[PDB]
Amino acid sequence: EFNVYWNVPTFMCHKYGLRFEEVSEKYGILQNWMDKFRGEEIAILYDPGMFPALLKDPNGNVVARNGGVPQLGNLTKHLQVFRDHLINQIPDKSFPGVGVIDFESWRPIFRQNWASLQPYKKLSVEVVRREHPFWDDQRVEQEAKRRFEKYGQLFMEETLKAAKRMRPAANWGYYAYPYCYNLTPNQPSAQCEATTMQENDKMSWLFESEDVLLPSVYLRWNLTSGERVGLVGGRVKEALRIARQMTTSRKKVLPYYWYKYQDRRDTDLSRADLEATLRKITDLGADGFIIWGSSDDINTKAKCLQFREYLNNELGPAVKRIAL
C-alpha cells in the first residue's frame, strides 16, 4: 500500500465556499472528514506542551520558556500542559490516524545544535561555568553536553510515551526526524552527513518508540533538477535505513512534502519537479507521503482560488498518476 495524506489547512477557505472535496473524491488522497484540519486521518500539533526553548522578544531580550535548555526544565509541568493540548486538539481517544508532533526548538544531539541553534550550546556551557569556576574548559564542555543530551532525550521520549499511552491506536512521530543535512552548509553533496547517520544510530530510543518516520523533503529553487531529486532521495533513503533496523514493529516512512519552493515561496512546484520527486519517493519503497501547506499561503479568498486551480491542474493529477 501507498497512502497520501492531506495536511494543508484548506479549512481556512471554507468560509468562501471552497471545501476541497476533490482532494479525496477525485485524487484518492486521504483527508479528514469534512476537510477538518485535525480529524481521524491526521493531526499535527505545533509546539505542544511547554518544551524548554530560547525565545527572542521584539524588545531584544532572550526569553527562557521552561528553562531555555532541557536540563533546566520542569518535565511534570511540560507533561501536564501537553496533556491539555492533546485532549483539546485530538478529543477522540480511538483516533487511529497519523499523529505528528512538531517540535523544532532544539535537537537532542548537542553537536547538531549549530548555526541559529548555537545559543543552546552556549547557555548549557555557561550554567556549568557558573556552578564550577575552577573546572577547566574541556571539563565544563563535557558536562554541559551530558546534561543537555540526557534531559534532551528525556523530554522527547516522555512526551512520545504520554501521547502513545493516551492515544494508543494512533501512529505517532516527530516532524523532521530523522535528519540528514544533504545539500546544506554542513554537507554540500546529496548524501547525508556521515556523523549524523552515526548519531541517528545512537537515537534508537526515538526511532524504536515511534510508529512513523517523517523526514522533511522540501525543495529549493536555487538547485539544479538532479539535485532536487538527490535532495529527496538522500533523506528518504536514510529514513528507510533506520526503519528496516527497527525491532519493536514495522515502522512507516511518510516524508513531509511541500508544494512551494522553500527559498522562493510564491512559486508552486513545476510539473517536472512534482513528477521526478514523487517518482523517487515511490521507487525507493516509502509507504506514502504527507502534503503540507502554510496558513500564510491560503489566508485570503484570492489565495484559496489560485491554490484550488493549482491543485486541479497539477498537484492532484501528478499525485494520482505517479503515486496512486
UniProtKB/Swiss-Prot annotation:
Listed transmembrane segments: none
UniProt GO cellular component terms: extracellular region
Keyword Glycoprotein attached: yes
Keywords associated with the record: Allergen, Disulfide bond, Glycoprotein, Glycosidase, Hydrolase, Secreted, Signal, Zymogen
Domain of life: Eukaryota
Tissues and organs where the protein is expressed, per its UniProt entry: Expressed in the venom glands of worker bees. It is also detected in the testes of drones but not in the queen-bee venom glands or in pupae.
Main location: secreted
Compartments reported by the entry: Secreted
Listed EC numbers: 3.2.1.35
SS bonds (residue pairs): 13-304, 180-192
GO biological process assignments: carbohydrate metabolic process; defense response; hyaluronan catabolic process
Active site positions, chain numbering: 104 (proton donor)
MF term (GO), any: hyalurononglucosaminidase activity
KW Signal (keyword) present: yes
Catalysed transformations (reactions): Random hydrolysis of (1->4)-linkages between N-acetyl-beta-D-glucosamine and D-glucuronate residues in hyaluronate
Residue positions the entry lists as glycosylated: 74, 222
Post-translational modification: N-glycosylated. Glycans found include a majority of small oligosaccharides (Man1-3GlcNAc2), most of which are either alpha 1,3-monofucosylated or alpha 1,3-(alpha 1,6-)difucosylated at the innermost GlcNAc residue, approximately 5% of high-mannose type structures, and 8% contains the terminal trisaccharide GalNAc beta 1-4[Fuc alpha 1-3]GlcNAc beta 1-in beta 1,2-linkage to the core alpha 1,3-mannosyl residue.
Purpose: Hydrolyzes high molecular weight hyaluronic acid to produce small oligosaccharides.
Subunit structure: Homotetramer.
Family assignment from sequence similarity: Belongs to the glycosyl hydrolase 56 family.
Name the UniProt record assigns to this protein: Hyaluronidase
Species of origin: Apis mellifera
Lineage, broadest ranks: Eukaryota, Metazoa, Ecdysozoa, Arthropoda, Hexapoda
